[PDB]
Amino acid sequence: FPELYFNVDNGYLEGLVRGLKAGVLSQADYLNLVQCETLEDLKLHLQSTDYGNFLANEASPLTVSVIDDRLKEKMVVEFRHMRNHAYEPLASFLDFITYSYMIDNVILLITGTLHQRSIAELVPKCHPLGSFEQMEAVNIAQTPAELYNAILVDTPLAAFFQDCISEQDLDEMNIEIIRNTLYKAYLESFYKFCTLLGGTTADAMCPILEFEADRRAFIITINSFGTELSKEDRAKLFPHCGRLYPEGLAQLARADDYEQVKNVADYYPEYKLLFEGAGSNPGDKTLEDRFFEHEVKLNKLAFLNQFHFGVFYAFVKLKEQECRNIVWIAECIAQRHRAKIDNYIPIF
Amino acid sequence: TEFWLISAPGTWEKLHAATTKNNNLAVSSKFNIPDLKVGTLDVLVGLSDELAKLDAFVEGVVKKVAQYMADVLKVQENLLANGVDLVTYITRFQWDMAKYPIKQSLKNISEIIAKGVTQIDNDLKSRASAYNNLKGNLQNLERKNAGSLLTRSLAEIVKKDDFVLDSEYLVTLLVVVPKLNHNDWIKQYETLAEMVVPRSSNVLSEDQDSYLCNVTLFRKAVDDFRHKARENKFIVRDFQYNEEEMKADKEEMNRLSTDKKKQFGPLVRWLKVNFSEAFIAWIHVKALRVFVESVLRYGLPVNFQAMLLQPNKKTMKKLREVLYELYKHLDSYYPYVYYKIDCNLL
Amino acid sequence: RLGFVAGVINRERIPTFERMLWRVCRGNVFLRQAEIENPLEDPVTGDYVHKSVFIIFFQGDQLKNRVKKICEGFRASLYPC
Amino acid sequence: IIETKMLMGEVMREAAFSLAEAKFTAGDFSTTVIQNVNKAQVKIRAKKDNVAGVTLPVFEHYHEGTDSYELTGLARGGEQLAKLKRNYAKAVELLVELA
Amino acid sequence: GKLIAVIGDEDTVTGFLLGGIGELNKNRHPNFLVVEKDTTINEIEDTFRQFLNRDDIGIILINQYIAEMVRHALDAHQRSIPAVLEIPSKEHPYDAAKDSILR
Numbered sequence: 005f006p007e008l009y010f011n012v013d014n015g016y017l018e019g020l021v022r023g024l025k026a027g028v029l030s031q032a033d034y035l036n037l038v039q040c041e042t043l044e045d046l047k048l049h050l051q052s053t054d055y056g057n058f059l060a061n062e063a064s065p066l067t068v069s070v071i072d073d074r075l076k077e078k079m080v081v082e083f084r085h086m087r088n089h090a091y092e093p094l095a096s097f098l099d100f101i102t103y104s105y106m107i108d109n110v111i112l113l114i115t116g117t118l119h120q121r122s123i124a125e126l127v128p129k130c131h132p133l134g135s136f137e138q139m140e141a142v143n144i145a146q147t148p149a150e151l152y153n154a155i156l157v158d159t160p161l162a163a164f165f166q167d168c169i170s171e172q173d174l175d176e177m178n179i180e181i182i183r184n185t186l187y188k189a190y191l192e193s194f195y196k197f198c199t200l201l202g203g204t205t206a207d208a209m210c211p212i213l214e215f216e217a218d219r220r221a222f223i224i225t226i227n228s229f230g231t232e233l234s235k236e237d238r239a240k241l242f243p244h245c246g247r248l249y250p251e252g253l254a255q256l257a258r259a260d261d262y263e264q265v266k267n268v269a270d271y272y273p274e275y276k277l278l279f280e281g282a283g284s285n286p287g288d289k290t291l292e293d294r295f296f297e298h299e300v301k302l303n304k305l306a307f308l309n310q311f312h313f314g315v316f317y318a319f320v321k322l323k324e325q326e327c328r329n330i331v332w333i334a335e336c337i338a339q340r341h342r343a344k345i346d347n348y349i350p351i352f
Numbered sequence: 353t354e355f356w357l358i359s360a361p362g363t364w365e366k367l368h369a370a371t372t373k374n375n376n377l378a379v380s381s382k383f384n385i386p387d388l389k390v391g392t393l394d395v396l397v398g399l400s401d402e403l404a405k406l407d408a409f410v411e412g413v414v415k416k417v418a419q420y421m422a423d424v425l426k427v428q429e430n431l432l433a434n435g436v437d438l439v440t441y442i443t444r445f446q447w448d449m450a451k452y453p454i455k456q457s458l459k460n461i462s463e464i465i466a467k468g469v470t471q472i473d474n475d476l477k478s479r480a481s482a483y484n485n486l487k488g489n490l491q492n493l494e495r496k497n498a499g500s501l502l503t504r505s506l507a508e509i510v511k512k513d514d515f516v517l518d519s520e521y522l523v524t525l526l527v528v529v530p531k532l533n534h535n536d537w538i539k540q541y542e543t544l545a546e547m548v549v550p551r552s553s554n555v556l557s558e559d560q561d562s563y564l565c566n567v568t569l570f571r572k573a574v575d576d577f578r579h580k581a582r583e584n585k586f587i588v589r590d591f592q593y594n595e596e597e598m599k600a601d602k603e604e605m606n607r608l609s610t611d612k613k614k615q616f617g618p619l620v621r622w623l624k625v626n627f628s629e630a631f632i633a634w635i636h637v638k639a640l641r642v643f644v645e646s647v648l649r650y651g652l653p654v655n656f657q658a659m660l661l662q663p664n665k666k667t668m669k670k671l672r673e674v675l676y677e678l679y680k681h682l683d684s685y686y687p688y689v690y691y692k693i694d695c696n697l698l
Numbered sequence: 699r700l701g702f703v704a705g706v707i708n709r710e711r712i713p714t715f716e717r718m719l720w721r722v723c724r725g726n727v728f729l730r731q732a733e734i735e736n737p738l739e740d741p742v743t744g745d746y747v748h749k750s751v752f753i754i755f756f757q758g759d760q761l762k763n764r765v766k767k768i769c770e771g772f773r774a775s776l777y778p779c
Numbered sequence: 780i781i782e783t784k785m786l787m788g789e790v791m792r793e794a795a796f797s798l799a800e801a802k803f804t805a806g807d808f809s810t811t812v813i814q815n816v817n818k819a820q821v822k823i824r825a826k827k828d829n830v831a832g833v834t835l836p837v838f839e840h841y842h843e844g845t846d847s848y849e850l851t852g853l854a855r856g857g858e859q860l861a862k863l864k865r866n867y868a869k870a871v872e873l874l875v876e877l878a
Numbered sequence: 879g880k881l882i883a884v885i886g887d888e889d890t891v892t893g894f895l896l897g898g899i900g901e902l903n904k905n906r907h908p909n910f911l912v913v914e915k916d917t918t919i920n921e922i923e924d925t926f927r928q929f930l931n932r933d934d935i936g937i938i939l940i941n942q943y944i945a946e947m948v949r950h951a952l953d954a955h956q957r958s959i960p961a962v963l964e965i966p967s968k969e970h971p972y973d974a975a976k977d978s979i980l981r
Contacts, residue, residue, distance in 0.1 A: 112814075115811070119814065125814075179811075179850070180850035180851070184853070223853070224854050226858070227852070227853045227854075227857030227858070228853070230849070231849040290858060291858060292855075292856070293804070328803055335799040335802075336799075339792070339796060341792070341796050
């Protein structure tokens, strides 16, 4: 019933984004990258993939800050191509992927405002996916975050700012409480939008958005032990989206200890066996290196369905792992510290 | 297993046998502790903040060593000087030579128990963690001997006729080719680079998915062939004379198997005497917590009447309610002296 | 030797203060209450409360550290006696 | 001096690799960290020590601890951070003894 | 002095600002300078004068890759305070400092 339609508007773009799956590096592509000894030789072993001739114009001294910036500018021009050819049931979905980067850029645009800076932080120091090159009133808003917050409501992040009054970001709230309260309102609005689009895109995507609400339920309550934010301050940072919602979030707001978040993940047998990072050992994978193996395990499962929108969000989050894996191979090669070079995630 | 220890002073020692008449609640053993040194009023209540911290700190040390009992080979054989925890709870008394009664009970008797427990906590954290490193390297013993031909060490596939000695003009490389591209590699092993031996292709050992072979080549043409081997999906692994040191690692797999066994009996003899000393140290600290808060809750003419209790199962709601009426008329949490101990180890 | 401290407290928690102060010091105190008349008022702490007199002797000189936290927990104001 | 120029050659190797572990987990925080500086945490006071009557200016570090990066990451990262903070506060404790 | 200053790099100063050495008093200056690839040598010389002639700057950290650009400038500094330390970077560890030339 969503299969006999959906090739009307989104049939060419789905076959395109599955053609970009075939360019995601396999295990045998990674095993030829870990044999490289210099970043000059990593330029050679990357040319046998579909990345080829992307570092051919930079410099003869090839540093790791150029490879990282040239890898992620290739994911932008692949995402901007699939957005400029998108139709309105899919273009509303592709704009919801960029709100995770518009949130990370709005917060970067108010730290310069509280410290009296300008557009000099905008162009070089923001992610190109969530980018402000339109809404040009943001680009000249030198006002101290009061006549500027009245311009951020002329931006697609306006519907998320209904829990942040312009007096709260005016030195009243910490800069990470403004992040995660927007990201709480972002995931809960993206979970409802992915439920209105029913059928195949609501059962291949809501398992991904349930785990994203349980990563930030576990990682927030673990990093909130030594710091000064109360239990009522992190209970409003939990997104009400995941599997943990009525019961786990009641216990996670009362934890105060790492052993009290381990026995609330024991109730859920998918989250236990993920809590066996166990960083008391010197060399092994930590907790977030085991949460990244589960983020990309659910993202590979979105390509097992066909007629759905979840094939596009599971490509951006697997081309982001390419910009994290190849840089990690390049950062263990340039430093010649390649005993932990196998601590990447072998996606395909 | 659980436990409850409650003293009920004011004959008065005969009403403790009346608690044994309620057969459905407890047996109400005596568990007498000897007379200690008194003479302080400010330091008696000031020791109550230190004795509560000492009873909790010594409880986690013995509960951490009971968790290490699964690593030596659930098991309940931790006798306390040829005596079970239930047999010692019916025959508990002061040692008077390890916890001396001539010394002060608040400061000096506790500090001898504190410094002894802190050294046994240090000797359990420093010595037992070193044996985990030889067992942590023992986890890497089979890790070097697991997987395919690439992930496995070559301590058992070695052969003197499989490599070319006098390597001044030759070199033998252990190449791995898949089972599907074996015929594609046999027509391309001599054409991967210049000056390649075209008849030295000999599959020494094969696996279920691939096959490991030997490929002789010159000393100068080893790098360009291996760079072309990555394009042709061939896995070339380096080889050296460290197999005699891997044969020494084959004996180190038996040396670590000997270092685990020689340290097994040494650590099990250490955990059998130190945990019994720390469990008796927490038992002496509970009686110090029972000698405290009984001269303040009750009067101190000379000394309060000493008494204890026994454990109970599933009738504690009726046992606390039957003691709630007899203790509400004594006073004006519980209305009397009460300390909840855990008889279980895990 | 020592053991005298004088303060004041409201009558709306005078029965709740003496019940909690006995369990915190494990006894060894003599707290004699004394009620008052028509209410006074303080600016920041206590507004329009018919208070009562309070003295906790306890003869301890280290139980004052067990009487310093209990006095501010129930909002009692002491004075040099 | 020379023994602690080869000791900071491996401490700064581990600390720069710990930054490489933290960018693998939590995005890029090289614009949040640089912008959010208001007050310092690790300062120095100049002590005096003398050999044969000639005083030598020596430095001793101290911590007036209020963390400006107490919340950094906190939903992504936060465990690779605060062990990057330990691997560079240990480098400052060494580099003040070199200074 | 009482502060620690760092010239460093783009990756070096963001590791040391997490150590807790950066202080911002906008009346005078910030106590660091992130050097990118597109800063001239004239900008490195100006902030190096600012850190020497400041009162509370006690220790100056700088990468040896950056210090060779102003090698004529720090040899002119022959005082006891502040200490100009030369630290390694990515693929530029250590060859020879100005302090070990003084031997």
